């Protein structure tokens, strides 16, 4: 039930929005959060599908801002399941009395900057009108589900799900003919759970994605209690890294090594599981020949996982460099295809023509299904923003200004839109880092910036157009030194039809980006104009 006026309005109650609330209060600022969902958690509230699990270690993917949380919470598994992460979020939410600062079931429709008085007016689908000095869009990176692009969807006779909008009551696939469309992280995690229940599971794969064993395991309770002795320290080590974790930064070039040392080295990562293999060698995302030797080793591990050679071959990713679509952690996913009741439908060879009342037609034949699961992803990074009529100076639409790709200074603001801040979004490290590291830094940087504005008695903060252009050009420029922009992924907006193909993230590493933000604030916010 939202206030008519506030210092800062926050959109979204997932990790980012909750923390922004907590810190803004500590800083003696009035602050409120609007959230479409029924409750806190963001991705961990919405993504409730069976198998949903973090692929950053529970010990790294957690808040560090509170010593008490660090000491009191007990993680249980190398990689936390979604129910567990949702209990942690509730634990924190509870601990700091956060819900009192949040309006649920409410979706922000539009926001417009008022130049006369230097404020945002912010409307919602319940007619709430809030005036705020600052607007923080804590509204996610992977928060607006994307349906795939083919017809007959509303004609399907059975039940229809998207993993990103999963039912609050467990879904029963027992005895069903089930289809999953999509084999990114969502579909990889969800499929082996549905394989346990369905009479027949059909996995509709388009481009195969690279996946490596998670090797999840219980967490040793002693290791935990040790870790806690120096938790603050351990976390500060994670902030001083490109990826926001303890990942080893392999110093060698993947080209300098024999085939023999290369295999022995990747074999050790493969038996160990997890994503650290992405940094086995310094140049894997930088040099196509280096990349390829690593990609080959992975593809061969893939072939060897599946008994039938033809099914095995269709599982092998082709045509793009390893790691350039987000790396996936799998758990019994490749093994699944050895089962009698699991069918890999290769839609590259036979593309989907349409959905029918009965199920799915490809160019080669029709599949009958009782249920269809869409693991088809998200209109990423800009999708949630673009859903909101956001309006800056001269009445510029954010959606129009960014229609060729997101334009920002430090990913934190855009020229022409003063008092507006984007948490962990395009133009910053964002999902290229452990997101809790990217999220805590952006929250602390924005909220300090806000507090600094108040201290000094100002009320207007605007990214300077020339710095914005300079920043966007720098982002593209350093991306272009890597293999990232070369591949169609949601990072480059490739999954939404008509969306501009532009790599959206800052690739220079969390550490450098935090250093660059720190010198910006240390000079009273170079590249902003403050009045």
Ligand X SMILES: CC(=O)c1ccc[n+]([C@@H]2O[C@H](COP(=O)([O-])OP(=O)([O-])OC[C@H]3O[C@@H](n4cnc5c(N)ncnc54)[C@H](OP(=O)([O-])[O-])[C@@H]3O)[C@@H](O)[C@H]2O)c1
Interface with ligand FAD includes 42 (CB under 6 A)?
yes
User: What is the closest distance, in whole angstroms, from the C-beta atom of residue 380 to ligand X in the complex?
Assistant: 7
* 430 lies in the binding site for ligand X (CB under 6 A): no
17 binds, among ligand FAD, ligand X, none (CB under 5 to 8 A by kind): ligand FAD
Q: Tell me how far apart the 2 most distant CA atoms of the chain are, in Å.
A: 70
Give, in degrees to the nearest 5, the angle at Cα 286 between 285 and 290. 80
Instruction: Rule CB under 6 A: choose which of 149, 240, 363, 515 binds ligand X.
Output: 149
Which of ligand FAD, ligand X, none binds 24 (CB below 5-8 Å, type-dependent)?
none
Q: What is the DSSP letter of 426?
A: T
- Does residue 148 bind ligand X (CB under 6 A)? yes
Span 117-156, contacts to ligand FAD by CB under 6 A: 138-143
Q: For residue 290, give the H/E element and its range.
A: helix 288-303
Position 43 contacts ligand FAD (CB under 6 A): yes
- Minimum separation from the CB atom of position 244 to ligand FAD (A): 8
Give the residue, chosen from 6, 10, 31, 37, that forms a contact with ligand FAD under the rule CB under 6 A: 37
Among 434, 441, 447, 489, binds ligand FAD (CB under 6 A): 434
Polymer length in residues for the chain: 531
140 annotated as belonging to a binding site for a ligand: no
Q: Which of 184, 192, 243, 321 binds ligand X (CB under 6 A)?
A: 184
Nearer to ligand X, 34 or 437 (CB): 437
Question: CB count, 10 Å around CB of 83?
Answer: 12
Q: Report DSSP letters for 157-213, one per residue.
A: SSEEEEGGG--SS----TT-EEEEE--SHHHHHHHHHHHHH-SEEEEEESSPPPEEE
Q: Which does 119 bind (CB under 5 to 8 A by kind): ligand X, ligand FAD, none?
A: none
Q: CB-hemisphere CA count at 13 Å for 436?
A: 19
The span from the CA of 84 to the CA of 81, in Å, is 5
Nearest to 367 by CA among 180, 173, 146: 180
Closest Cα partner for 189 from 316, 82, 295?
Answer: 82
Q: Which is nearer to ligand FAD, 177 or 442 (CB)?
A: 442
14 binds, among ligand FAD, ligand X, none (CB under 5 to 8 A by kind): ligand FAD
- Which pairing describes strands 352-355 and 359-362: parallel, antiparallel, or unpaired? antiparallel
- Our finding on whether 491 is near ligand X (CB under 6 A) is no
CB 270 within 8 A of CB 213: yes
Annotated binding site: 16, 35, 43-46, 53-55, 61, 108, 141, 183-189, 206-207, 325-326, 435, 490
Using CB under 6 A, list all residues that contact ligand FAD. 11-17, 34-37, 42-43, 45, 47, 52, 54-56, 61, 107-108, 138-143, 384, 387-388, 423-424, 431, 434-435, 439
């Amino acid at each position: 039930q939202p206030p008519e006026e506030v210092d800062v309005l926050v959109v979204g109650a997932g990790f980012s929005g909750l923390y922004a609330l907590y810190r803004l209060r500590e800083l003696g600022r009035s602050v409120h959060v609007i959230e479409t969902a029924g409750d806190v958690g963001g991705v961990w509230y919405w993504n409730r599908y069976p198998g949903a699990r973090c692929d950053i270690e529970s010990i790294e993917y957690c808040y560090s801002f509170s010593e008490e949380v660090l000491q009191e919470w007990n993680w249980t598994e190398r990689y936390a399941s979604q129910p567990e992460i949702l209990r942690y979020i509730n634990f924190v939410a509870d601990k700091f009395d956060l819900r009192s600062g949040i309006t649920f079931h409410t979706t922000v429709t539009a926001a417009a900057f008022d130049e006369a008085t230097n404020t945002w007016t912010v409307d919602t689908n319940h007619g709430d009108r809030i005036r705020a000095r600052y607007l923080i869009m804590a509204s996610g990176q992977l928060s607006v589900p994307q349906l795939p692009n083919f017809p007959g969807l509303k004609d399907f006779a059975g039940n229809l799900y998207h993993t990103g909008n999963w039912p609050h009551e467990p879904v029963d696939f027992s005895g069903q003919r089930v289809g999953v469309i999509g084999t990114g992280s969502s579909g990889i995690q969800v499929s082996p759970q549905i394989a346990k229940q369905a009479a027949e599971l059909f996995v509709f794969q388009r481009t195969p994605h690279f996946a490596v064993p998670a090797r999840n395991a219980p967490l040793d309770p002693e290791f935990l209690a040790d870790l806690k002795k120096r938790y603050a320290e351990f976390r500060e080590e994670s902030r001083n890294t490109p990826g926001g974790t303890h990942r080893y930064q392999g110093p060698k070039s993947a080209l300098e090594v024999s085939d023999e040392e290369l295999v022995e080295t990747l074999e050790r990562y493969w038996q160990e599981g997890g994503p650290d293999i992405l940094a086995a060698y310094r140049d894997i995302l930088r040099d196509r020949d280096a990349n390829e030797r690593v990609a080959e080793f992975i593809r061969n591990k893939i072939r060897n996982t599946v008994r039938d050679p033809e099914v095995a071959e269709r599982l092998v990713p082709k045509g793009y460099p390893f790691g350039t679509k987000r790396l996936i952690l799998e758990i019994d996913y490749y093994e699944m295809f050895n089962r009698d009741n699991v069918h890999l439908v290769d839609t590259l060879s036979a593309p989907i023509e349409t959905i029918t009342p009965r199920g799915v037609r490809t160019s080669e034949r029709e599949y009958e299904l009782d249920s269809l699961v869409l693991a088809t992803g998200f209109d990423a990074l800009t999708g949630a923003l673009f859903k909101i009529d956001i309006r800056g100076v001269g009445n510029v639409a954010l959606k129009e200004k960014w229609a060729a790709g997101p334009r920002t200074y430090l990913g934190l603001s855009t020229a022409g839109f003063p008092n507006l801040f984007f948490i962990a979004g395009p133009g910053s490290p964002s999902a290229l880092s452990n997101m809790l590291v990217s999220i805590e830094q952006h929250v602390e940087w924005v909220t300090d910036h806000i507090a600094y504005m108040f201290k000094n008695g100002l009320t207007r903060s605007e990214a300077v157009l020339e710095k914005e252009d300079e920043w966007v050009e720098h982002v593209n420029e350093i991306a272009d030194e890597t293999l990232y922009p070369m591949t169609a992924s949601w990072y480059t907006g490739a999954n939404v039809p008509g969306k501009p193909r532009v790599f959206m993230l800052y690739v220079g590493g969390f550490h450098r980006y935090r250093q660059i933000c720190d010198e910006v604030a240390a000079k009273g916010y170079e590249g902003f104009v403050l009045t």
